Symmetry: none
Subunit: 414 residues, 2 copies
């Protein structure tokens, strides 16, 4: 009934709104983030439409002392981290210090990738496991023992992917298969903002997607490849044929560990050709580069010229479809299942005033938070969603805005 939410961007705004819709679970919330004015505007926008009591504060979640002081002052039962993944460990340390629960949506990656202690563990991992993405669960899983000892719950990656995709996996394994062997996670965004080119997020993340090496997991080994070197096509329910490429994703790591006997796990994402050409163009004229220069570094000078940051929410027309195709065995017989959710952009902006990218992450975040606090998912330790009972989550998904679909004998990627 008393919750502290850290961060106040797109995801947070959806998660906070859905939270105020279930005011009987959440009687009081505190919205703290780097720029307090964002917290205040959201409070303004929400106050009067909910019975939930909303307080706000400025907070630099990169400083644990500042985070601890806050928990100490507001006294919450849990902390929902909807800030950046850079703050994961700091917020987790404070939760342990003050004995409150932790929920987030993205795993940890250092903000400064030149930090000596971070490189040493990172480089060692690049040599041992085989994949070189800057983020992974190693740092957060390491809290397993201290959290279990403090009787604290740490629910990790509770958005859509990661998050729901793991809930889909657990659900599939509990009701449809005896053993899952192949998991292909397909993320499709078929929305049209109306502009020739525009970015939904921090424009440097877009650069990370198309340029970072892509990787997957196959029979106990990570497999890394040249960025965007694996292409495919799929006819997405309610959207259509879309070109999709294999990228690396957080959940592949937890899934490979938690789904017994699993043989291969891949994650693909859609990329329209105009978008792809628009961005090898921008990176060719070096407009995405970070090399500071004078006299302003460019990538964010571009951020200035591009369309309003978040004012694509009212403009965007289209749909997203994120799901998973499972191949496994039930009663000694091969079986394929596809579970997905189709989210419509304009329904998202009409309801909470955001795009579907924020919506599909925000809603699962609140549900993950609800189940932890209401007791359903309160277990000491650090957890990824596939390790918990999927049932109450799948119900909350139907109840709170993200109904799902299950298809037996679907169309395969290959």
């Amino acid at each position: 009934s008393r919750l502290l939410v850290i961060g106040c961007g797109g995801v947070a705004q959806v998660a906070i709104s859905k939270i105020c819709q279930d005011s009987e679970t959440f009687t009081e919330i505190m919205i703290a983030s780097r720029t307090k004015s964002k917290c205040d505007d959201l409070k303004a926008k929400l106050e009067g439409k909910t019975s939930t009591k909303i307080e706000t504060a400025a907070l630099d979640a990169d400083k644990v002392e500042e985070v601890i002081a806050l928990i100490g002052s507001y006294k919450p039962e849990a902390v929902l981290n909807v800030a950046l993944p850079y703050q994961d460990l700091t917020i987790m340390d404070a939760c342990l210090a003050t004995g409150v629960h932790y929920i987030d949506t993205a795993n940890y990656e250092a903000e400064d990738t030149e930090d000596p202690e971070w490189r040493a563990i990172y480089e060692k991992r690049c040599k041992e496991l085989g994949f070189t993405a800057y983020f992974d669960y190693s740092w957060q899983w390491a809290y397993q023992e201290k959290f279990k000892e403090a009787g604290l719950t740490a629910l990790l990656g509770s958005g859509f992917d990661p998050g729901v995709t793991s809930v889909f996996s657990a659900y599939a394994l509990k009701h449809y298969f005896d053993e899952i062997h192949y998991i292909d996670i397909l993320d499709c965004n078929g929305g049209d903002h109306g502009y020739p080119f525009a970015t939904n997020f921090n424009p440097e993340i877009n650069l990370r997607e198309v340029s970072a090496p892509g990787s997957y997991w196959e029979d106990g080994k990570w497999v890394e490849v040249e960025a965007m070197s694996i292409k495919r096509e799929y006819d997405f329910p309610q959207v259509g044929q879309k070109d999709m490429y294999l990228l690396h994703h957080e959940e592949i790591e937890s899934l490979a560990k938690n789904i017994p006997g699993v043989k291969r796990i891949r994650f693909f994402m859609t990329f329209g050709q105009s978008y792809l050409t628009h961005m090898k163009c921008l990176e060719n004229v070096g407009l995405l580069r970070t090399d500071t220069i004078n006299f302003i570094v460019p990538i964010q000078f571009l951020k200035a010229l591009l369309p309003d940051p978040a004012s694509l929410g009212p403009r965007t027309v289209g749909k997203t479809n994120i799901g998973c195709i499972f191949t496994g065995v039930k009663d000694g017989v091969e079986k394929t299942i596809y579970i997905y959710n189709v989210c419509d952009h304009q329904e998202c902006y009409a309801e909470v005033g955001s795009q579907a990218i924020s919506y599909t992450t925000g809603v699962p975040a609140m549900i993950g938070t609800k189940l932890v606090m209401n007791g359903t998912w309160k277990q000491a330790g650090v957890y990824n969603l596939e390790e918990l009972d999927p049932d109450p989550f799948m119900e909350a998904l139907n109840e709170y805005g993200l109904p799902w679909v299950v298809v037996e004998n679907p169309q395969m990627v290959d």
Copy 2:
């Protein structure tokens, strides 16, 4: 034997390089431009490989007295203008004042196209002639009588196009035809404002004593370029159409086409989409932020030439004269782009021919008015060998 060179960008870098390779004609040269640092780096980079004595200076060729004081001080026999077209009139004035010769590569375009008295001249022209390009020869042709009286030579547009494309025309008229009727000029392949107006300015050509202006890039064609292949072409307006229509007797139609790769046309369309070509911290204009951004990675070839259709001994005849230059043999020789190379060499030849006596004629001239022969032998000699095709393939 003594020359003042104004400007020190790409073209100038090539030109001076070529100039120093012929030190028996050019004993000492002076390299002066806005930023003296480049003049010095170029000077260090060359001297020791040449016996030509090299001096350098800072000069804002926009102020006429500063130019005159430099000419009076350095006492050169001629001035090669390889700065921007904005400095043409300023430099020609100094040349006339001090009695020295003049050579440039592009004709005049005012730097501030909003300046009142310029526009009055400009618009009057737009109404009479029919073409609206900001640049034209009228300004410089006006100097004809004064230069002739001072016994001075002003050679206009001595690059590839204009320039060599005009030498090709004079050559074709002298050796291959009795009369040229159709001239089609074909140019095949770091300033986005030049590229931007290149793809957006109205296109125009000349036909039967009249100019015809059309929608920008509304006219497309394709041609299989010798040594390069099939490429896409669009009709653009170009300087030499004006001089040729005046100087090629009986010519009936003159057109200019330029190639535009699909890869380039989209890059251009992408940049215009994210608003990087716009013109408007809250004190910046986009297109100039873009210039701040940008040798061996570049691979390819250029092919610039002209297709003439005419009459010789009462029979229609077609001729194709062109030059093929490859980017790296020129970057391996003088360290530059093929665009600067194909303009740099013509810039020197005209200068050499003007002051060694070959082309010294009092007055203002475009290249088609002079004997093309010494210029082409020179083109073969200094790096830009040409080709002649009888019965080549047409356009249309």
